[PDB]
Each structure stands twice: as C-alpha cells, then as structure tokens.
Design an enzyme around this catalytic site. Structure first.
Site, mmCIF file in Angstrom:
data_model
loop_
_atom_site.group_PDB
_atom_site.id
_atom_site.type_symbol
_atom_site.label_atom_id
_atom_site.label_comp_id
_atom_site.label_asym_id
_atom_site.label_seq_id
_atom_site.Cartn_x
_atom_site.Cartn_y
_atom_site.Cartn_z
ATOM 1 N N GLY A 14 53.155 66.056 4.269
ATOM 2 C CA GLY A 14 54.180 66.546 4.388
ATOM 3 C C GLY A 14 55.248 66.043 5.119
ATOM 4 O O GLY A 14 54.917 66.018 5.988
ATOM 5 N N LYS A 15 56.531 66.696 4.440
ATOM 6 C CA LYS A 15 57.989 66.423 4.942
ATOM 7 C C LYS A 15 58.221 68.157 5.595
ATOM 8 O O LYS A 15 57.616 68.971 6.693
ATOM 9 C CB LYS A 15 58.600 66.599 4.602
ATOM 10 C CG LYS A 15 58.701 64.131 4.308
ATOM 11 C CD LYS A 15 58.695 63.352 5.408
ATOM 12 C CE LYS A 15 59.302 62.504 5.262
ATOM 13 N NZ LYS A 15 58.689 61.280 4.453
ATOM 14 N N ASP A 129 62.726 80.057 3.010
ATOM 15 C CA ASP A 129 62.568 78.596 2.012
ATOM 16 C C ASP A 129 61.080 78.680 1.630
ATOM 17 O O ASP A 129 60.429 78.142 1.094
ATOM 18 C CB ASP A 129 62.056 77.617 3.221
ATOM 19 C CG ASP A 129 62.533 75.990 2.218
ATOM 20 O OD1 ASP A 129 63.235 75.989 1.237
ATOM 21 O OD2 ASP A 129 62.843 75.053 3.317
HETATM 22 C C1 LIG Z 1 47.203 67.521 -1.719
HETATM 23 O O1 LIG Z 1 47.636 68.201 -0.116
HETATM 24 C C2 LIG Z 1 47.128 67.719 0.830
HETATM 25 C C3 LIG Z 1 46.948 68.788 1.917
HETATM 26 O O2 LIG Z 1 47.986 68.969 2.114
HETATM 27 C C4 LIG Z 1 48.844 70.346 3.341
HETATM 28 C C5 LIG Z 1 49.912 69.877 3.706
HETATM 29 C C6 LIG Z 1 50.585 70.933 4.813
HETATM 30 C C7 LIG Z 1 49.776 71.466 4.858
HETATM 31 C C8 LIG Z 1 48.495 70.929 5.047
HETATM 32 C C9 LIG Z 1 47.851 70.828 3.977
HETATM 33 N N1 LIG Z 1 47.625 72.654 5.563
HETATM 34 C C10 LIG Z 1 48.848 73.607 6.077
HETATM 35 N N2 LIG Z 1 49.816 73.013 5.997
HETATM 36 C C11 LIG Z 1 51.249 72.943 7.059
HETATM 37 C C12 LIG Z 1 51.421 73.589 8.116
HETATM 38 C C13 LIG Z 1 52.249 73.734 8.554
HETATM 39 C C14 LIG Z 1 53.416 73.703 7.849
HETATM 40 C C15 LIG Z 1 54.400 73.874 8.977
HETATM 41 C C16 LIG Z 1 55.689 73.193 8.644
HETATM 42 C C17 LIG Z 1 55.600 72.816 7.093
HETATM 43 C C18 LIG Z 1 54.656 72.457 5.998
HETATM 44 N N3 LIG Z 1 54.810 72.072 4.768
HETATM 45 C C19 LIG Z 1 53.922 73.195 3.906
HETATM 46 C C20 LIG Z 1 54.054 72.196 2.668
HETATM 47 C C21 LIG Z 1 55.191 72.102 2.753
HETATM 48 N N4 LIG Z 1 55.064 70.637 0.906
HETATM 49 C C22 LIG Z 1 55.638 70.623 3.097
HETATM 50 C C23 LIG Z 1 55.985 71.098 5.334
HETATM 51 C C24 LIG Z 1 53.915 73.002 6.627
HETATM 52 N N5 LIG Z 1 52.219 72.504 6.588
#
Ligand SMILES: COCCOc1ccc2c(c1)ncn2-c1ccc2cccc(N3CCC(N)CC3)c2n1
EC number: 2.7.11.17
Length: 265
Positions: A14-15, A129
């Site tokens: 992710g971004k 957000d």
């Molecule tokens: C097909 O997806 C596979 C798994 O993708 C993810 C993607 C992000 C994940 C996650 C799993 N398990 C935890 N996170 C987290 C854990 C901490 C975060 C802190 C800041 C920003 C995040 N993201 C959330 C998803 C968004 N689309 C991008 C930024 C974060 N995402």
C-alpha cells in the site's frame, strides 16, 4: 528484499497518506506483518506529527482497528518503521470499480465500520481519511480501519477543526469554505462514512471531477444523485442521504446511525 533486525521486508502492499506499507516476514515467530516505512528527510521537506500518530496508535485496541505492534526508530537512520498486524485480504475495494458490493455485504462491512468509528470517537480520535481503500478485510471476513496518518486527537466531546486534509472526494462541504472556518470533527467522519457506503454499493463516488475546484463546488452545491444501477432499497437511500446532508448540524450522528432500520435488519 531487505533484512531489518528480525524482519525481512518484501513487496509494497500500500501507499497511504505518508510513506509506504510493506509486507514483512518476522523470523522469530514465523509469520507476516505489515510495515509502514517513513523517510524523515522526505517528511522534513513535505517529526512530532509522526510521534503524535504513534501515541494515538498505542492507545487503540479494538477488533475493527489495525493494531500497532512496534516501532523501529534509530536516531542514526533516515527511515522510521511502524510494524502493524497484517490483515490478509487487503482493502475491501478500489474505487472506481464495475464490481460493487451487494447490499448484504455492504451492510456487514458498514456494521464493522460503525463499531470501529464509534470506538475511535470514544477514544477522542477523528480518523479523517475514512474510505474503502483504508478498510482492510481480515481472515475472519471483518474489516479493520487503517491509516491514521492525518488523524487528530481532541479534548472534550468533539474536535474543533480549521484545516482540510484527507482524500478530496471524501471531504465534507463545511471543510471546503474559501474563508477560514471552524467545523466539528465527528461530523466529518460521518460524511466520509456516507461517501464510503455509497462507494460500497455503487462502485464510484457521489461527487467526482478531474478538476479539484469543480469537485469542491459539487461537494458544496450539487444535490446528491443516485446512479441508475444497481437499484437499492429505500432505507439504504435514506441512510446515505442523511449521512451526506451538507448541513453538519442536521447530519445524522453515530448513535442515530446505529438505530437506522437499514443497519438493524
Ligand atoms: C491485496 O492486499 C494484500 C494485503 O494488503 C494490505 C495492505 C495494507 C495493510 C494490510 C494488508 N494489513 C495491514 N495493513 C496496513 C497497516 C498499517 C497501515 C498504516 C498506514 C496505511 C496503511 N494502508 C492501508 C491500505 C491502503 N490501501 C494503503 C495504506 C496501512 N495498512
């Protein structure tokens, strides 16, 4: 790949509002985590807001919020690493999409979102957000709220805000005035929840424009319209309409959302 103490960093997953998120294998306990990676140099161009986010995250323990596990921050190095629990299936959807969720699937996830937001607001955090791409689907099929990069902590019953952050298409009209104003934080999260619910069932945002000024103008002055397809229930239309009330004084609140007939059936 790259080794970081007991972690092996893998592909970007992710971004986010700041930095990137990477898949990380932990050698000690033989499982994966999600690692947010930040550059201090890049932040200094674009310190204490990061440690504010960390203090917020350390307060939070709820099944519909992503858990911070640890922080790796060497004063020698430029990079700061925040280790989170990994939520397997990733974001509930990308917008736009031609495959939106069914009403029943949307309700299930929206119920999780209500519980999560209710918890955050109780803990005196405004998320700022809320959108489908920040809602992660776990192994158990439930959503967890992620990305506290623009979130605010407040005192008392609500945040009194004057700044505009987050994702443009999810910003409430009261936060888009030309002159400096003060607006309630909780009602901003409710508006974004309403945009999110609309996206769940239609696969596109209610207000959209490639030109930022025109998007703002639509959010502020265009009446809500539902797309022709799919057809949705009267009670869901009512809930969305009340969450996207442009007047933050009349906009439905979370205690009212919990009792709405679409939510309780
Ligand atoms: C097909 O997806 C596979 C798994 O993708 C993810 C993607 C992000 C994940 C996650 C799993 N398990 C935890 N996170 C987290 C854990 C901490 C975060 C802190 C800041 C920003 C995040 N993201 C959330 C998803 C968004 N689309 C991008 C930024 C974060 N995402």
């Amino acid at each position: 790949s790259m080794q970081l103490n007991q972690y092996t960093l893998k592909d970007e997953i992710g971004k986010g509002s700041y930095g990137v998120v990477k898949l990380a294998y932990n050698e000690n306990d033989n499982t994966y985590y999600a690692m947010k990676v930040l550059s201090k140099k890049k932040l200094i161009r674009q310190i204490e807001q990061v440690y504010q986010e960390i203090a917020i995250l350390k307060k939070l323990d709820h099944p519909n919020v992503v858990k911070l596990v640890e922080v790796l921050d060497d004063p020698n190095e430029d990079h700061l690493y925040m280790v989170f629990e990994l939520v397997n299936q990733g974001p509930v959807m990308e917008v736009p999409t031609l495959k939106p969720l069914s009403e029943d699937q949307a309700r299930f996830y929206f119920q999780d979102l209500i519980k999560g937001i209710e918890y955050l607001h109780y803990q005196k955090i405004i998320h700022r957000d809320i959108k489908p791409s920040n809602l992660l689907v776990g192994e158990d099929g439930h959503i967890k709220i992620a990305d506290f990069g623009v979130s605010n902590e407040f005192k008392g019953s609500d945040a009194l805000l004057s700044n505009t952050v987050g994702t443009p298409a999810f910003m409430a009209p009261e936060s888009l005035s030309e002159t400096r104003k003060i607006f309630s934080g909780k009602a901003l999260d409710v508006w974004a929840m309403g945009v999110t619910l609309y996206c769940f069932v239609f696969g596109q945002c209610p207000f959209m424009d490639e030109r930022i000024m025109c998007l703002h103008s639509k959010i502020k002055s265009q009446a809500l319209e539902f797309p022709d397809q799919p057809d949705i229930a009267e009670d869901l239309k009512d809930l969305i309409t009340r969450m996207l009330d442009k007047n933050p004084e009349s906009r439905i609140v979370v205690p009212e959302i919990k009792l709405h007939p679409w939510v309780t059936r």
